[PDB]
Amino acid sequence: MNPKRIRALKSGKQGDGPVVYWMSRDQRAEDNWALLFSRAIAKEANVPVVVVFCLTDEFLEAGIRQYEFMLKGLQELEVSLSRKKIPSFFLRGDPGEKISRFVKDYNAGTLVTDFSPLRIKNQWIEKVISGISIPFFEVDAHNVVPCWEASQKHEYAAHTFRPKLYALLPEFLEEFPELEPNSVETLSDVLETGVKALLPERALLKNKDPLFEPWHFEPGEKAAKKVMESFIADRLDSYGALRNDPTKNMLSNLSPYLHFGQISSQRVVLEVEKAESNPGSKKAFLDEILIWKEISDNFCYYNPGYDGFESFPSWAKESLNAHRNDVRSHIYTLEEFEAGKTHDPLWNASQMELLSTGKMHGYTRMYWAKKILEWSESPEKALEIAICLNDRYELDGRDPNGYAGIAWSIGGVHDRAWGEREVTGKIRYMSYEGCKRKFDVKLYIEKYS
Template sequence: MGPKKRQLSPTPPKKKDKTDSEDSSEEAGTTSASLDEVKSEQTADPSERLFQEINKARAAVGKSIEDFKFNKKRVRMLSDCKVASEDCGAILYWMSRDGRVEDNWALLYAQRLALKFKVPLHVCYCLVPVFLDASIRGFHFLLGGLEEVEKDLLSRNIHFHLLLGAPPKVLPKFVSDNNIGGVVCDFAPLKVPMRWVNEVCKKLPEDVPLCQVDAHNIVPCWVASEKLEYAARTIRPKINNKLPEFLTHFPPVVLHPYSSDVKYEKVDWVRAEKSLECDRSVPDVNWIKPGYRAGIKMLSDFVEKKIRWYNDKRNDPSQDVQSNLSPYFHFGQIAPQRAVLVVQKYKKQYKESVEAWVEEAVVRRELADNFCFYNPNYDSLKGAPEWAQKTLNDHRKDKRPYVYTKKEFEDGKTHDPLWNACQMQLVRDAKLHGYMRMYWAKKILEWSKSPEEALEIAIYLNDKFELDGRDPNGFVGCLWSVGGIHDQGWGERAIFGKIRYMNYEGCKRKFDINTFMAKYKTISSKINPWTASKKTKK
């Protein structure tokens, strides 16, 4: 007889009867789950007050994930092996899309397993030298957040390992070398990370199970819908019907009671940065800082200063009412679910604004994941609906009023000062206002040699300069503008065919374009303090 096996599939432990949907109202004090102790009930800093309130909300749910009825629908088994050996040495959480400690269902599930098996818990991140068209700007934001993750995990007696290389090459070896008995990974619907997961699954030892937790979407992607959805109107009722089950509070990640025998070596962040082979020509930005704490501060600024104006002014690029949380969502540095829980507290005061923001943060964002998960052609016109492909092809030979190269677009050297301002916002601020993103991409379609080239240029520029590039939202936004996905046919016109049209005069009627253009003629980039602190002496 071989060694005994223990279940790795998501069977909840029989502990206290607190469910995933409970919002406990009992008073909670400081627990080992909170990295930062609650210093005072009163604070003048709204972001610090929010930080304390969130810590208390976690503590009120339960002392740890063991006291919490984990919803097993968040988990799916990927490997043929479903159980871990009795003699497994540790549990590993392979962190990828969700780079945070708190409010992370994947990490919580991994700790739940490690506590159940009474073994150490490890977390690893596999840093690849190149990822799609990501520039050093995006990698610096990623590394800044992971530095915080390392510190937060060590304070909980959990080892963090930064593995240099593609996951299929480095992760199976780590599993074998460290007697890992079970692996938990998070979920991303893009082709490259999905391929990584499939290859890792094949290369893991046969007796090591691999399961996946959707720690990014509020309603897990495979639960929200089992098929490709046509539009927001088709997925909205499916998500809204499931929100009462999944939009819950999180328990804390606690001080792990089982220590690893493996000698821990802190991550060499300078070496990690040097290993990157990406485009280093794109400078960092100084208006946003990476990490969970910075994300909570940005969330606090939004609900304290901006949300009251969001419904009326969110489509006006000259007004600063956006939440600016997208980079934190993209890198997983704060959970969209946490942000929604916070924003919903303001529904009585600003009902329309809260509903509008939640629509974007939940329905539209999860619709993008649905599209990329069920349509592998999300980055190609082959992914567009048939009517859109036909109409673009019918107008393929239409004369373009202007034709620009990729380099001319990248440098903002078109005849249109409004489009150039959009590109300068992208280059200098690492973001592009949602309304202007539509105009920006549609004009690339109008001024490119072909629809295929237009989509390729839009994705390239978005991924190179946006902090939240290489994201389902970005791919869907580009293909919506160029290829009509999640939209309908409109009045037919040259070049666009029946694809929705936007123009300069329409923007001029909608908002003060001069204010927007003036701003992006003068703004400048500065070095991110994180980057400066990591410079090495020659």
Template sequence: MSLPASPVHAQRLYCHTPSVRGSGPVAYWMSRDQRLHDNWALLQAQHMARTRQAPLIIVFCLVPSYSGGARRHFDFMLTGLRQVADSAAKLGIPFVLLTGEDPPGELAGFCRTHAIGTVVMDFDPLRTKQQWQHTFAGHWEGECLEVDAHNVVPCRWASEKQEYAARTIRPKLQRQLPEFLDPFPELVPHPVPWRGSLLPEPDWEAASRSLAAPEYGPPLSWSSGEETALDLAREFIASGLSAYAEKRNDPTAGAVSGLSPYLHFGQIAPQRVALMARDANWAPAESREGFLEELVIRRELAENFCFYNPVYDCFGGLPAWAQQTLDDHRGDHREVVYTFEQWEAARTHDPLWNAAQQEMVQTGKMHGYMRMYWAKKILEWSASPEEALSTAITLNDRYELDGRDPNGYTGVLWSIGGVHDRPWKERPVYGKVRYMNDRGAARKFDVQAYIRRFFPATASERQGTLPLG
């Protein structure tokens, strides 16, 4: 009996090897979207395997020293992956964990050994993952297909160029949302068992021992995995969404979803959360629309920026007006200049900044409003914009559970260099880049309550951090 057409929208697919047609087993190279359900890439892989009555396997390539990742990142990820492997086994889908510093080479060798015919990959806009995929596709003889399971509107399809701002990408996404914001089909038990040579069982303890990851910050209490992510999303939609529009910029209100680590590791699909928010008719329209603006429009704007701008984490990635104005103010007097070690240890004269840094170190996450303030003050008290970018990105990627993410890079470049923003009133150091200060924060929320929570030092202890000048 023939199967129906693929449940995956054709515009989610991108073939890296258009002249090659695979046969035999299908491997899903899981990377960015680390979940079993609501995963268009895995659904496409299963469809292809069922069509040719072939086995299906999931392969994950663990890189022990990946991009400066800390132990907290790897622990969160491996816990979630172990759950994926256990759930996949119940559906007759083997999970293979490869370990090494050369994912394209490791995967190519595995595919040749086990006669894989087709590899389905996750879309990822970041340089390292793009390079891995191009290297693999260029040196492997089989079929190689990419599926965008991370964006509601596929990044390659949403726009063919780097968008200037939210106002330029918003109408494009809104026009296409009805076509792509559709329900997910179920992943079914795979009917064809693995018949090839013996597959290696994942050795999770050995994988953990292989990690070259430093212990940045204390251990975290976050639970990991797609079931936890879905429960958290349900709780937010049911009890938090209604107040989102009113309280989302208040770091003391607990009004945000807390989903960013789960979205970053692909433990929940943004499309699933968008469907839940869209259908939450009990919540005010302003809150639903504001949440969807952040979840879909702003997040996919960040995807667009990183995909089309190869220097998305550098001074050269800033818009021309921002580069010019920051260049014009390089020689401006700074009231204080801190070293990286002082930033990392939260040893500045500003207790609000210190509290934000401590929130990130202690919890693995910083409230979005404070991320903007935090990054802008790094610009104000650094010797150069390049140094500020390096400091902010390094700290973000070192401590945030959602580090090394398009949202993170875009947020830092927005704060420090006006990406997706416009020129504002000119002032020292910032030039025409938007300015923020603690007085503005105090108009939005109880600054002292936030400081007491994350930086509960006495006044005399604060004075002993670092003086101005």
């Protein structure tokens, strides 16, 4: 029950009513530090614990592909919490109004939320603390090491973040205690009206055939566990050598579950650590899910402008500024990028995989973002194009990994300077020819036509 995982957002008079767990980022019942800590206060105050989820008005900025995935998991989560005698209340509207009224109407004793370094979450918090007088607590249930404890400042590179995080692993990498059970309407109806409001925004092909294919990733806490088990048994050993090959589905495919909190990253690392495998494959995977995933939270926590040109490293800002007026080979607008109407078939295939499956391969994701910088009027124009496309079509989008990853590809955050080139300056450059020497670009293109 390590107290380093919890910050105090605002102190106040401890109410005599139930502890309310405001669930935003970690939509699961198993392996949830925020859920288990909320139960701890409930036992200490002789009072039950309840869970509240807010359905905000920002869902219309994304597609149905993310709406049903989240809502389907919440339907499963509702059953799980009822098995432990924990009621779950689902509210519609924005949290600033909804959380304040629910606390007043229920006389909540303590308010607990999970941690997210995103700008929108801080916006919701700022409205909440100005509407309640009960204590407000928040718990990092997303990172193995708490984000404010891994580092106290912005980390310039992964090689400076790795020694700090690994030094704290023996303390924070621990098992999850069991969620002991306890001593504003239906979920299906909200789904019904949600798609009806989103249906005009459906991504469609020429013949009005829906582009999205929902059979690639089943949502829910249960489906996440099988994916983790399938990756360890079947794909973990080849991960070290085939993670850069989009033609092979050797990735873990855990990101849609990780983003929604349907599976805990600590559970993944615990299971991978005791599994016996090729030694590189374990280290390569551990680097992504521990170093790179949790440095993405660090990037968003300590940079208020994580989605802006201002948060780029000084060398990258100077190089891109010096190459701002360089004539670009081609310029594409947002619609051409969206529908895949560029001269690059490799980029077009990556966009089609994104539009069809909702999860573009990690290696082609780097190629996809860097070509936006090459084919945009300004680095700022490419930054918003990349963010707009990523948050709209990726199942794992609107995530700290997304903004950190875009910043890495476009602004070279958590990277070093490379050879000076036109337009892109010293930013790491990936070429169509270089991709051909790494993997078979042909079979990747045919698969997504």
